[model samples]
Target: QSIKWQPHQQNKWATLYDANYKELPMLTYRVDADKGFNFSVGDDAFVCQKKNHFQVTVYIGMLGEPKYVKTPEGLKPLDCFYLKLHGVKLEALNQSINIEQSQSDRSKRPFNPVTVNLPPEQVTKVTVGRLHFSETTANNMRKKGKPNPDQRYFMLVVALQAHAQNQNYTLAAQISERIIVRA
Candidate 1:
């Protein structure tokens, strides 16, 4: 899938290399989705290195109406927006401690897993998630089948959700990338 960067940081931090090494600038991007959630981000849509770890945040918008709502609010222009993060499978680790967990020592909590939030003018910026690399965390990741001892790679699947009571619909981004975490 072809991706487009906004005019602001398009020429600068267009790729993850710029975001990881260049100055900390807000990164906005656009990508085609499953039509239902085809939207673009304004800022905070970049992946950067934090100390020995990594952080990824995304600000999404262009919320076209795929599913309208009818409530006491009187036919809201568009249903509220939210995100669904998969691939890490934190719940699996929590359910059975025997399995290796990413956040074994609880260095950084996975942000914005799944929740409902009111859309403010059809825009939302959220801290998608964080990856930590402590001694215990690294060992756990190795046992859990993570590549690169010093860095952990994960495939983050971002799912867009539009809520309207029982008439809710979701659209997953066409492109998913491998996120890396450093020790």
Candidate 2:
């Protein structure tokens, strides 16, 4: 029997879909050979991994989320936070999306391929957790990492929390997930 894969469904294999998003987009999604827990997904409930099972469900609130602001009638949802994960520059490991800010303007930031919608209030208040990579995937991400035809050199899981005060404190967690590479 042949296997039929559907889009929007997470699996051990990669999925390809044309992303018409305005910001960042990726044509190809390389699935991990060895599936496991990835803390960067956010929240303890949404991050999961098991035998033939690995999925992410939690979504962090971004600039598009609602926030309180002062007005004639007092405070109201005057601001919004948008949500999206950008491929962090190898230099900046796990910076929050909006908090990192653009070089030209501090108000602007970057985004990744997946676009998620979330309200600011729904966002978790603390740094959720972390994820680890297998020996093979870890090596593939390194600069001097060997060129593996089947392994994509994007294996960093960055996680950060945003708050009203902007006193962003990055959390240092461990990564130990293992993903093998085959030629």
Candidate 3:
């Protein structure tokens, strides 16, 4: 849904439609993947022999209800927001890829297409993987270790973009739940 916000006059406590619209108390969310507590990687880099479920849930407040936030203009209720998961590029892996690799290969590695949204207070769930891993990179990860040293981790970047009344605001978070590379 699209709305136009007209510039208003000097500040007074202007009443807006509650429309049952709530203000979000929090800005970030958490992610969960199917394989119970840990995620899996394998000969393919990362994969699930079966479809793996992924869920993103906003943390509810102590009151047991999801919170909301004022619209960008601070004049009305927010309409909706989008939540996306992006793949993080590690500095160690940057030097290994061919500069000419096709865009499709790159696209297959991330969670963008599986991203979901929230219509105020809600959860977004989707399935991901059969996620292919790079042989050279996976090997490097097992051998030389990452530039940061010790354990290797993949960052699942979570981005939240809120929208309403011709304005939008964005925020992000990151997670590295667990590593389960297949033998």
TM-score of each: 0.36, 0.23, 0.39
lDDT of each: 0.35, 0.26, 0.35
Best by TM-score: 3
**Error of model 3, residue 146, in angstroms:** 13
lDDT for each residue of candidate 2 in 18-94, tens digit (9 for 90 to 100): 12212212122221212333333222111222122222223332332233332233333322222222222222345
Could you tell me the lDDT of residue 30 within candidate 2? 22
lDDT score, candidate 3, position 170: 48
What TM value does model 3 have? 0.39
Error of model 2, residue 67, in angstroms: 4.9
* Stretches of model 3 off by over 4 angstroms after superposition: 1-23, 36-79, 90-153, 164-168, 177-183
- In candidate 1 the C-alpha lDDT for residue 157 amounts to 44
Candidate 2 — worst ten consecutive residues by lDDT sum? Answer: 9-18
List the pairs of residues colliding in candidate 3: 23-68, 23-69, 24-67, 24-68, 24-69, 41-180, 41-181, 41-182, 44-133, 45-133
